[PDB]
Structure 1
Amino acid sequence: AEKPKLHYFNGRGRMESTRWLLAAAGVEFEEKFIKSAEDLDKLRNDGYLMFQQVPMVEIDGMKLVQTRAILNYIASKYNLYGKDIKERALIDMYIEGIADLGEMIIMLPFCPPEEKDAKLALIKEKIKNRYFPAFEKVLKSHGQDYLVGNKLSRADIHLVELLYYVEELDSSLISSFPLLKALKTRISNLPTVKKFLQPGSPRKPPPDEIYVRTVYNIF
């Protein structure tokens, strides 16, 4: 078999978590960037997209769509999904909270400018009161260097990803949560993640104005 092939726009969006997880697992992938509406419609009409939507990853003979199908498979494959049914329950419970928060961040740049002050402030509120307290509590309780099973899981990789986006948004939000600060540091220093955080990697930048309207020219 070949290297996993990521089909998306050249930008973060719904593919970035998969990029983080593959790189976290030491897997070399390639990207075929959708540059235009035509690029997408070609994928659609060639029957590559089960639901007419990207992200799409060609991996192990399959054309997998839907971000969570993609991510589960990778996590399962590279032993990043715990060791039994209960660890998975915990892992799922966590990564789904992270995906609800991350969903608001991914959408933020698209809602109209008059609603931005309000939608951001509600994210900061939920970060401060809901999600970060949630995850600090987990770390405080068992005292261990990883969210689940006392070893690296996709939850870890998904949270740390989200802590870089929360840093980009407001660097003080994490200030009251020392366990999340240390988590970020340890995970960022894992040889595979460290290489992914360095310049030149497939890691994608935040959305700028160009990114938004380029996105509108493809959706």
Structure 2
Amino acid sequence: PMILGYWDIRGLAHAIRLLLEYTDSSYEEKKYTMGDAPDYDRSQWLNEKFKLGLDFPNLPYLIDGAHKITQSNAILCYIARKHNLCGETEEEKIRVDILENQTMDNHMQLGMICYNPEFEKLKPKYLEELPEKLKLYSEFLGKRPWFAGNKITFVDFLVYDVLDLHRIFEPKCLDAFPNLKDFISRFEGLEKISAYMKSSRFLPRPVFSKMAVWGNK
């Protein structure tokens, strides 16, 4: 069975875990524990980091037999390809590519301030800007059932994670975009998704690692 390595948190592995579940993939998980402050001992991972045969050692990392992979989006396409969720038409592949990177951006943005000691000070501006960000995704999705088009793709998992992370950060954020709310309903309503969410495996928190100022627990 495949084996997904990551910290004992949600973070970046979220969309992957969801995808793996949606695809009925056979897998295990090698969760790494980070020590408490002030050191935040990472040795559990560092003692293994370069022993796994990974090309660019990192987290998350996926191991499927002889295939060792790093970089979240790389791991997602890998999985998605086995179930034709990496896109089909031309326009689909474009939307996929754009989102694939757009979400990664918007994510690192939140991550950056949530790990910034001055989070409290920065928070005001970030929130002032967020509505427009969400709007973009609303406009983008429009009347489509999924982001790529009529068929679901791995990018839907990425958009979800991002959108979800924001209802958690600011609950009223998605209130102004019905289609987005429906998207979340539609995504969580997915049979294998719904079931996974009610299982013991579902790890929706902590959102970030112990070093984080927000969602660190």
Q: TM-score range by the shorter chain?
A: 0.7 to 0.9
Which aligned pairs between 1:96-135 and structure 2 lie closer than 5 A?
96-112=101-117, 115-129=118-132, 131-135=133-137
Which aligned pairs between 1:117-196 and structure 2 lie closer than 5 A?
117-129=120-132, 131-140=133-142, 143-196=143-196
Q: Do the aligned partners of residues 80 and 67 (structure 1) sit closer, same or farther apart at CA in structure 2, a change above 3 Å counting?
A: same
User: Unaligned 5+ residue runs, structure 2?
Assistant: 35-41, 213-217
Query: Could you tell me how far apart the structure 2 residues matched to 1:187 and 1:25 are?
Result: 14
Query: Could you tell me how far apart the structure 1 residues matched to 2:144 and 2:21 are?
Result: 23
Percent identity (aligned): 22
Residue 213 (structure 1) shift: 4.3
Deviations 1:178-201 (A, max 9, x none): 110111101110001112222412
Query: Could you tell me how far apart the structure 2 residues matched to 1:101 and 1:205 are?
Result: 19
CA contact 2:14–2:161 (8 Å) conserved in 1:
no
Q: Do the aligned partners of residues 73 and 174 (structure 1) sit closer, same or farther apart at CA in structure 2, a change above 3 Å counting?
A: same
Question: What residue is the counterpart of 2:83 in the other structure?
Answer: 78
CA contact 1:13–1:106 (8 Å) conserved in 2:
no
Larger relative helix fraction: 1
Count of aligned pairs: 205
Query: Could you tell me how far apart the structure 2 residues matched to 1:17 and 1:121 are?
Result: 28
Residue 144 (structure 1) shift: 2.6
Cα root mean square deviation, aligned: 2.2
CA contact 1:20–1:157 (8 Å) conserved in 2:
yes
Which residue type is aligned with residue 106 of structure 1?
Answer: G
Query: Could you tell me how far apart the structure 2 residues matched to 1:47 and 1:197 are?
Result: 30
CA contact 1:8–1:55 (8 Å) conserved in 2:
yes
Runs of 4+ in 1 over 6 A off after TM superposition: none
Query: Could you tell me how far apart the structure 2 residues matched to 1:13 and 1:197 are?
Result: 16
Q: Which TM-score applies when normalising by structure 1?
A: 0.83
Which residue type is aligned with residue 27 of structure 2?
Answer: F
Question: What residue is the counterpart of 1:212 in the other structure?
Answer: 210
Question: What residue is the counterpart of 1:217 in the other structure?
Answer: none
Residue 103 (structure 1) shift: 1.6
Deviations 1:133-184 (A, max 9, x none): 11211233xx231122311112222212222211111110111111101111
CA contact 2:115–2:211 (8 Å) conserved in 1:
no
Does 1:64 pair with 2:69?
Answer: yes
User: Unaligned 5+ residue runs, structure 1?
Assistant: 215-219
Q: Do the aligned partners of residues 126 and 195 (structure 1) sit closer, same or farther apart at CA in structure 2, a change above 3 Å counting?
A: farther
Which residue type is aligned with residue 59 of structure 1?
Answer: D
Q: Which TM-score applies when normalising by structure 2?
A: 0.84
Of the three residues 49, 56, 61, the one matched with 1:51 is: 56
